[PDB]
């Protein structure tokens, strides 16, 4: 005669603290759109599961997968590109939409998959004494490829007269920043947008989403699975000294 477990007995690893996004959220100055930090992230899990009770963002849209399926799909590469956009350009900015932004500075693969998270930064960007750190390239000699950056600051030569690195006739200055007008209305308030780019390929699947943990029973034979290794037995309490490692 064999006694089987009621439903199951499964235990998961410890807290396993998430990625150190606190430093990025609390960063005094976020990375500029033209120059965005690129640091590999691993040995952690996405923090979207804890955002149930928090500061809701303006929009959270995942075209590739539904918001509830994020925990059901493993992640390999986590790279977030944060930038600032104008409110009136939110409607004009979208995948598959032709426009000036899409043509020159916003270029991405047609099959790119990811999530878009937008939120109003007026609560923090306000009264910042109109810092001009943010900058962008309004015009360029060609279309920037994905994940590409331009380092050429030479004055663009439109006419036959050489610019010689200084302003002149038919000479254009490509680099430009978003003018901060204190009289800007609600619709002109800047909005911070983050796009998560990742292919989920070329790297091992190590990061997994949170999984619900059932209850534990003792003094009764039950199945268990620790670190992949499966077994069956009874879990009890022992006071025998054991090595910390």
């Amino acid at each position, epitope marked *: 005669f064999r006694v089987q477990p009621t439903e199951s007995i499964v235990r998961f690893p410890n807290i396993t603290n998430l990625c150190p996004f606190g430093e990025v959220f609390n960063a005094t100055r976020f*990375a500029s759109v033209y120059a965005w930090n690129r640091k590999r992230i691993s040995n952690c899990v996405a923090d979207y599961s804890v955002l149930y009770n928090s500061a809701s963002f303006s929009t959270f849209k995942c075209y590739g997968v539904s918001p509830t399926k994020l925990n059901d799909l493993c992640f390999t590469n986590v790279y977030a590109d944060s930038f600032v956009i104008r409110g009136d350009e939110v409607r004009q900015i979208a995948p598959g939409q032709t426009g000036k932004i899409a043509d020159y500075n916003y270029k991405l693969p047609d099959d790119f998959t990811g999530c878009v998270i937008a939120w109003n930064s007026n609560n923090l960007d306000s009264k910042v004494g109109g810092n001009y750190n943010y*900058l962008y390239r309004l015009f360029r000699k060609s279309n920037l490829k994905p994940f590409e950056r331009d380092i050429s600051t030479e004055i663009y030569q439109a006419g036959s007269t050489p610019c010689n690195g200084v302003e002149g006739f038919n000479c254009y200055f490509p680099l430009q920043s978003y003018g901060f007008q204190p009289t800007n209305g609600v619709g002109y308030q800047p909005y911070r947008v983050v796009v998560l780019s990742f292919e989920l390929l070329h790297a091992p699947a190590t990061v997994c989403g949170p999984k619900k943990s059932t209850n534990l029973v003792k003094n009764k034979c039950v199945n268990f699975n620790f670190n992949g290794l499966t077994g069956t037995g009874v879990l009890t309490e022992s006071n025998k000294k054991f090595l910390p490692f």
Partner: nanobody
Amino acid sequence: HVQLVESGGGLVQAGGSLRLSCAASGSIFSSNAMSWYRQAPGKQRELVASITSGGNADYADSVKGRFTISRDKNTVYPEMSSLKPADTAVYYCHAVGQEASAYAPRAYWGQGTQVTVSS
């Protein structure tokens, strides 16, 4: 205008290792891209290195590692190594300035600093 000059120089011993620290004192700084160029007789200006506003830095293979510049918290740290007699050249620094059209709408081109190696 920003003056990056720190000191005239000093004696250097064979196989030395000096890590100069920029003063980083003056007016309010800005997130402007920086470019480092090398000049010498018989050669024109070349794009030796380019460091962005903390995003990433690109350096030539010849100057990779042994000569480098790092940007951190609005501070420039130069790393100097592999000192040889042939390194005698002139360093040029190029920056980007937008709010400079009030009286001189021209780029702030710092004076080239000459460096020579001789025992």
